[PDB]
Structure formats: C-alpha cells, structure tokens
Amino acid sequence: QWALEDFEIGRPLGKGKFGNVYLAREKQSKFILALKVLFKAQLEKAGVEHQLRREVEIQSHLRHPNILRLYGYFHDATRVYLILEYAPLGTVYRELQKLSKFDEQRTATYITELANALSYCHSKRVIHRDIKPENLLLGSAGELKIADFGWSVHLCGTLDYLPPEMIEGRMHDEKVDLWSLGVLCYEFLVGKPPFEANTYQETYKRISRVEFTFPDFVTEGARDLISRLLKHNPSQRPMLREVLEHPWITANSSKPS
Ligand SMILES: CCC(=O)Nc1ccc(C(=O)Nc2ccc(Nc3ncc4c(n3)N(C)c3ccc(C)cc3C(=O)N4C)cc2)cc1
C-alpha cells in the first residue's frame, strides 16, 4: 500500500508529455525520493498501459547501485504514481554541458559503471536500455544511474545514438547496448556524439556507413575501445566483459573489475 497523502511534494524535477517528476518525501520517514506522475489519458492514447506495466515490473525487480531504483507504485482516479530513487546531482548531460567534455578518468569510470549495470541487465534478460546522457542520472557520490524505464523527461539528437540495425529497421540484439557505449564514450571525451550533422539524412549516412573521426587529443586506447564498439554488424561488437577488461578502461577507471 502507498497513497499520495503519504508524500510531501516539492519542486518539479522534470515536466513531460506522458507525465511529470517531482521531488518528494515520505511523511513518516522524512526520506527524500521522487514521484513520477503519469496521466492515464495519454498512456491509453499510445496503447502502452501494459507496455508501461512491464517496465514497472522490470524496474522494481532490479537492484543495482548504478540503476535508478523503483521503490513502489500506486494509482488514484486517473494517474499512475511511480515512487522512484532521487539522484541529487542531475543528468550526465548537464554535467557535460558545464564541463564541455570529460577527461579520461571520469569517462572510463562512467563506462565501467554502465557496463556493470548493463551486464546485470543482460543477466536478468533485459537486453536493451536507453543510455543517452539525458537519461543517465548522477547519485550523491557522482555515481552514474540508468534511469530510463520508459517515458523519459527531456541537434539531430534522436538518431544520434541509434545503431544502424535500428535506423535500418532490421532485427536488433543485446548488441545495441554496445553501440550505445561506443557512442557515449566518444561523447564524453569529445563533447559531441560521433555522427552529428546538420540534417537527419547526413547523420543517417554517417551512422549507416560508420563514418566518424577523432580530434587529435583522443588517445589510441580510447580510439581502440570506441572503434571496437562502433561496428556496423552487431556480432563483431565485443562482449560487455571485454569492455570492463579493456586496457584503457582498467588503466583509467576507479571502480574495479
Ligand atoms: C545553465 C543550465 C544548468 O546547468 N541548469 C540547471 C538547473 C537545475 C538543475 C537541477 O537541479 N537538475 C536536476 C537535479 C536532480 C535531478 N534528479 C532526478 N532524480 C531522479 C529522477 C529525475 N531527476 N528525473 C527528472 C528523471 C530524468 C530522466 C530520466 C530518464 C528519469 C528520471 C527519473 O525517473 N527520476 C526519478 C533532476 C534534475 C541542473 C542544472
């Protein structure tokens, strides 16, 4: 059992189409968290009510330090309420806007944390998560959090992290997450994703043909990891544990492996 009157509400942390996210506090415990408010009107008007309920079941049964936790959920008259972990330091995207680009040590550490979280996801038969920087949150210690369990709260950015097999409407694997990592790692180091262009058409062209280059300052190890991940055909992409044990990752990250 949970009800709305069990929570004090503070400010909106994000406003969205399918719903909003609020800072909140359970009244008895005084414990800070977040309350996602989704409108049933707009959930049935995309036929996803039982696509949402699957994600609720997915996220509630995931316990991982780098996955945004789902404590519980309830419904009133017309809205679904998700009781969610609050991440005090905001989106990885914002951090990247401030710093422009990340250094090798933070990048590799973030990539470690994602890879662990994703390996865990793959172990629970969860073969894909979205991990664009806007959908990755930061905990109180700066530790990275996969937050995307549907219906998020945020130039050609839509295409930018999609692998060829998806843009091309072919079948897509657990290897999609590897392409995403490739894209993130590049973005962290460079401050731009690898296939950015002024038109969707051009971005497609570059994704499709895997055409990208590195600025001078990117080191050969970083270049090696990224080139290993950005492969057109997904079966050539390395396994998640080849990422956790890559020379550049172990050399530069703090979180062990
Ligand atoms: C000049 C511009 C600038 O830097 N200006 C600025 C101004 C203000 C701020 C700022 O206080 N931003 C901030 C700080 C903390 C959070 N935490 C958070 N914790 C948990 C969240 C969640 N957000 N929301 C919205 C999600 C967002 C995405 C996804 C996929 C999932 C979630 C989600 O499910 N939950 C539960 C959010 C926002 C930062 C920067």
From Swiss-Prot:
Modified residues (Phosphoserine): S208
Catalytic activity: L-seryl-[protein] + ATP = O-phospho-L-seryl-[protein] + ADP + H(+); L-threonyl-[protein] + ATP = O-phospho-L-threonyl-[protein] + ADP + H(+)
Binding locations of ATP: K17, K36, E85, Y86, A87, E134, N135, D148
Tissue spec. comment: Highly expressed in testis and weakly in skeletal muscle, thymus and spleen. Also highly expressed in colon, ovarian, prostate, neuroblastoma, breast and cervical cancer cell lines.
Induction: Expression is cell-cycle regulated, low in G1/S, accumulates during G2/M, and decreases rapidly after.
UniProt activity-regulation remark: Activation of CDK1, appears to be an upstream event of AURKA activation. Phosphatase inhibitor-2 (PPP1R2) and TPX2 act also as activators. Inactivated by the G2 checkpoint. Inhibited by GADD45A and p53/TP53, and through dephosphorylation by protein phosphatase type 1 (PP1). MLN8054 is also a potent and selective inhibitor. Activated during the early phase of cilia disassembly in the presence of CIMAP3. Inhibited by the small molecule inhibitor VX-680.
Effect of F212A: Decreases the interaction with phosphatase type 1 isoforms
Keyword annotations: ATP-binding, Cell cycle, Cell division, Cell membrane, Cell projection, Cilium, Cilium biogenesis/degradation, Cytoplasm, Cytoskeleton, Isopeptide bond, Kinase, Membrane, Microtubule, Mitosis, Nucleotide-binding, Phosphoprotein, Proto-oncogene, Serine/threonine-protein kinase, Transferase, Ubl conjugation
Variant or mutagenesis effect after changing R79A: Reduces ubiquitination and proteasomal degradation
Summary of subunit composition and partner proteins: Part of a complex composed of NEDD9, AURKA and CTTN; within the complex NEDD9 acts as a scaffold protein and is required for complex formation. Identified in a complex with AUNIP and NIN. Interacts with FBXL7. Interacts with CPEB1, JTB, TACC1, TPX2, PPP2CA, as well as with the protein phosphatase type 1 (PP1) isoforms PPP1CA, PPP1CB and PPP1CC. Also interacts with its substrates ARHGEF2, BORA, KIF2A, PARD3, and p53/TP53. Interaction with BORA promotes phosphorylation of PLK1. Interacts with CIMAP3. Interacts with GADD45A, competing with its oligomerization.
Protein's UniProt name: Aurora kinase A
Origin species: Homo sapiens
Highest classification ranks of the organism: Eukaryota, Metazoa, Chordata, Craniata, Vertebrata
Gene behind the chain: AURKA
Included range, full protein: 127 to 391 of 403
